[PDB]
């Protein structure tokens, strides 16, 4: 399903970027 | 009259969407909450910039997926966002994950048609991000929690 697909790489995005803040 | 919170989201929004998919400031400085919505515009240009930077050929595969699947990106970018956020995590990092994205439809759309109007997906995404988080924003005191989230506060 492409929403689910779009949503999960968003969401790897958006943890990575939530690593970095606390770095 | 009313909704600070809606107005001043979708002027932050629309902005980094104009300008990322042109590529020109609107100058026009400030009005109403101008110093937060400043800064918070200069934190989305840093970290909204970066995120398209890092992840540029997912996005473009996300892209790709939008547009074969449904018709409307604008309708399609919303399922999109909920369907993010439908497993109740909710933090700075996947609002400006999803604004970044849009950024990138936004610029999409501008080559696809270089007419199209940025206004829609920018409302579209505001409406989800200030109804759907309503009372969470307020709790992480709107837009001066965004910016002091991703606002480094030491180099060294
Ligand atoms: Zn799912
Ligand atoms: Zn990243
Ligand atoms: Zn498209
Ligand atoms: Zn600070």
């Given at each position: 399903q492409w929403v689910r697909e779009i949503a999960a790489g968003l969401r790897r995005a958006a943890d990575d970027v939530n690593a970095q803040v606390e770095r | 009259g009313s909704d600070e919170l809606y107005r001043q989201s979708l002027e932050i929004i629309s902005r980094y969407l104009r300008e990322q998919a042109?590529?020109?400031?609107?100058?026009?400085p400030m009005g109403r909450s101008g110093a937060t919505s400043r800064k918070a515009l200069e934190t989305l240009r840093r970290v909204g910039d970066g995120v398209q930077r890092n992840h540029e050929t997912a996005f473009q595969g996300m892209l790709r997926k939008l547009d074969i699947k449904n018709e409307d990106d604008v309708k399609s970018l919303s399922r999109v966002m909920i369907h993010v956020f439908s497993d109740g995590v909710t933090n700075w990092g996947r609002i400006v994950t999803l604004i970044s994205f849009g950024a990138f439809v936004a610029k999409h759309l501008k080559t696809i048609?270089?007419?199209?109007?940025?206004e829609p997906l920018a409302e579209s995404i505001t409406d989800v991000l200030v109804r759907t988080k309503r009372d969470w924003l307020v709790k992480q005191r709107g837009w001066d929690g965004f910016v002091e989230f991703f606002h480094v506060e030491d180099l060294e």
């Open positions: - | 042109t590529g020109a400031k609107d100058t026009k048609n270089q007419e199209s109007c940025i």
